[PDB]
């Protein structure tokens, strides 16, 4: 139908501190979760079945991300490292050392030969997956880096920061192509490219999501109604059914907007703390949501539309 009807199907318990991130594997079979409890957990995407715990970080994890082939994970930790993991063996393949403060955010490129990271040390680093070596350190921002993401062909990186900027980087050279958002404030708490790489979705800590045209550097859409003044809350393009924007909220709800009309089309109730992370299944109309330490659960929601 014209609106979704997401309904709670499973609650996934086991983390002992706040959940920080949830991500579906590109092949759709898994959900990965990261937590302040220093653990990664792997769950069945369709039935929430607990699969395994992946351990090794010495402090909390703020983010986890899948390789394009669903075989590897990368995690970003307060221990100042990222780790590359073989999901099947659960083994740490590489530890990526160089950041001088907490690593907050990470992603593979589509090729999955590179990892990008953002840190409280105000830098963005680009890493070689095969060797675990740091290829480039970008002096990207003047405050902690909240998000990093590659576009569809891997040629661009978008970064965001508490400094109030969103910057687009040439992967190959590390050089800045554009400062897309250029304000002293508000802090930019999240950014990512649209699936086709033409748009950037940006969150600011003034309860606002905006959809930007990268090429023209202009705001096309604004989404409001939710609460976001403190946390770096993920947002998503939902593309399997109707074309939605999805975000967590500091009022403990998942918000779903019509991307084109900007109308709120659903609010998902059930969590008992801030919903810091949401993920959209690559093929099925399924949302994963995760909450902070009063809750510590992941919820799987399913829609007909
Ligand atoms: C908690 C968290 N938010 C982000 C957004 O990039 C990374 N980790």
Reading the block at residue 243, the tokens are 């074309």
Both structure tokens of 84? 């590359």
Superfamily, domain 1-305:
YVTN repeat-like/Quinoprotein amine dehydrogenase (2.130.10.10)
What is the rounded CA–CA span in Å between residue 48 and residue 65?
Answer: 18
Ligand 1 atom nearest 148 alpha carbon: 6
Q: How many angstroms separate the alpha carbon of residue 191 from the centre of ligand 1?
A: 10
CA distance 252 to 270: 8
Pocket test for ligand 1, best of 18, 161, 187, 190 (most atoms within 8 A of CB): 190
CB neighbour burial string for 179-218, b if at least 16 within 10 angstroms, e if fewer: ebbeeeebbbbbbbbbeebebbbbbbbebebbbbebeeee
Do the beta carbons of residue 155 and residue 170 sit within 8 Å?
yes
CA distance 115 to 63: 13
Q: Structure resolution in Å?
A: 1.6
Where in 78-182 does DSSP place strands (E)?
Answer: 82-86, 92-96, 103-108, 114-119, 124-128, 134-138, 145-150, 156-161, 165-170, 176-182
DSSP state of 207: T
Q: How far apart are CA 267 and CA 258, in angstroms?
A: 12
- Best substitution site from 21, 36, 159 to test ligand 1's pocket, by max atoms within 8 Å of Cβ? 21
DSSP 175: -
Hey, which residues does 204 pair with through a beta bridge?
A: 188, 208
Omega before 3 cis (within 30°)? no
Q: In what order do the strands lie in the sheet with 61-66?
A: 61-66, 72-77, 82-86, 92-96
Compute the distance between CA of residue 216 and CA of residue 51 in angstroms, rounded to an integer.
45
Tell me which DSSP letter residue 130 carries. Answer: T
Q: What tokens does 277 get?
A: 């992370």
Question: 30 C-alpha to center of ligand 1: Å?
Answer: 19
Nearest CA to ligand 1 atom 7: 105
For ligand 1, mutation pick of 75, 276, 279, 296 (most atoms within 8 Å of CB):
276
| Half-sphere exposure at residue 7, Cβ-oriented, CA atoms within 13 angstroms | 5
Experimental approach was X-ray
Q: From the CB of residue 148, how many other CB atoms can be counted at a distance below 10 Å?
A: 29
Which residue's alpha carbon is at the smallest distance from atom 3 of ligand 1? 232
CA of 31 to the centre of ligand 1 (A): 16
Task: List pocket residues of ligand 1, CB cut-off 6 Å.
Answer: 20-21, 62-63, 104-105, 146-147, 190, 232, 234, 276
Distance, in Å, from the CA atom of 10 to the CA atom of 61, rounded to the nearest integer, reads: 23
Q: Report angle CA 225, 228, 231 to the nearest 5 degrees.
A: 155
Q: N- to C-terminal Cα distance for the chain?
A: 5
Question: 74 C-alpha to center of ligand 1: Å?
Answer: 13
Q: How many angstroms separate the alpha carbon of residue 276 from the centre of ligand 1?
A: 8
Whole-angstrom distance, CA of residue 77 vs CA of residue 293 = 17
CA 67 to centroid of ligand 1, rounded, Å: 17
CA of 2 to the centre of ligand 1 (A): 30
- The closest residue, in CA terms, to atom 4 on ligand 1 is 232
- From atom 1 of ligand 1, which residue's Cα is the shortest distance away? 20
DSSP result, 268-303 = E---SS-EEEEEE-SSSSEEEEEE-TTT--EEEEE-
Distance CA 75, CA 9 (A): 27
């Amino acid at each position: 139908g014209s609106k979704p009807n997401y309904a709670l199907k499973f609650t996934l318990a086991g983390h002992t501190k706040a959940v920080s991130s949830v991500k579906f594997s590109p092949n759709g079979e898994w959900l990965a979760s990261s937590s302040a409890d220093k653990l990664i957990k792997i769950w069945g995407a369709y039935d929430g079945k607990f699969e395994k715990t992946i351990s090794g970080h010495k402090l909390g994890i703020s983010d986890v991300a899948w390789s394009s082939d669903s075989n590897l994970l990368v995690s970003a930790s307060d221990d100042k490292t990222l780790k590359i993991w073989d999901v099947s063996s659960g083994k740490c393949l590489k530890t990526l050392k160089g950041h001088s403060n907490y690593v907050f955010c990470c992603n593979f490129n589509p090729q999955s030969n590179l990892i990008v990271s953002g840190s409280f040390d105000e830098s963005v680093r680009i890493w070689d997956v095969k060797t675990g070596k740091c290829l480039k350190t970008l002096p990207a921002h003047s405050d902690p880096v909240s998000a990093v993401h590659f576009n569809r062909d891997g040629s661009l990186i978008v970064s965001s920061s508490y400094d109030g900027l969103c910057r687009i980087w040439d992967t190959a050279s590390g050089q800045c192509l554009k400062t897309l958002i250029d304000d002293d404030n508000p802090p930019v708490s999240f950014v990512k490219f649209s699936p086709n790489g033409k748009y950037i979705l940006a969150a600011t800590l003034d309860n606002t999501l905006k959809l930007w045209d990268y090429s023209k550097g202009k705001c096309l859409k604004t989404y409001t109604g939710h609460k976001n003044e403190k946390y770096c809350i993920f947002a998503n393009f939902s593309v399997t059914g109707g074309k939605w924007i999805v975000s967590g909220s500091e009022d403990n709800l998942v918000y779903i907007w019509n991307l084109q009309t900007k109308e709120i089309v659903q609010k998902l109730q059930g969590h008992t703390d801030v919903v810091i992370s949401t993920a959209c299944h690559p093929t099925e109309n399924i949302i994963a949501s995760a909450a902070l330490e009063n809750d510590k659960t992941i919820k799987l929601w399913k829609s007909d539309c």
